[PDB]
Structure formats: C-alpha cells, structure tokens
Design a protein around this nucleic acid. Structure first.
Length: 50
RNA sequence: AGGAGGACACAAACGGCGCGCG
C-alpha cells in the first residue's frame, strides 16, 4: 500500500521473498557459470538461511 | 385551308514507541 506521497509502505513478507529470489537467482547464475565448489557451497548455505 | 408528314461503476491502514483512561 502507498503512504502519504509517492512512496509505498514497507511489507515484511515482500522483503523476505525478495531476499530469497535474489539469492536463488545468484545461485542459478553461478551454477550456469560453473563456480568453484567453495562458492557454490556458500551460496547454497546463504539460500538455505534465507 | 384539303391532304400528307412532322463512458458505467468508484470514498482514507499497518507496525513500533510513549502517555492516559477504564
């Protein structure tokens, strides 16, 4: 929902979904580009925690 | 002369902090 002026009120679930989507897209991008095992492990841990 | 031809619809939100009252 917007608030007074050209701004939208912060939504809790939206930000969590945004974090999850960004992390998962980064993981997909790396897995396409064959990142090293250490990097993909760290990305997978970050995705799980997100 | 005769004769012939010729736009309908549509009324303000969500979480903290503080205070106060029952």
């Amino acid at each position: 929902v917007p608030l007074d002026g050209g701004r939208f009120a912060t939504s809790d679930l939206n930000d969590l979904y945004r974090r999850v989507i960004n992390r998962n897209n980064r993981l997909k991008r790396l897995l396409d580009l064959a990142a090293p095992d250490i990097i993909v492990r760290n990305e997978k841990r970050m995705l799980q925690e997100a």
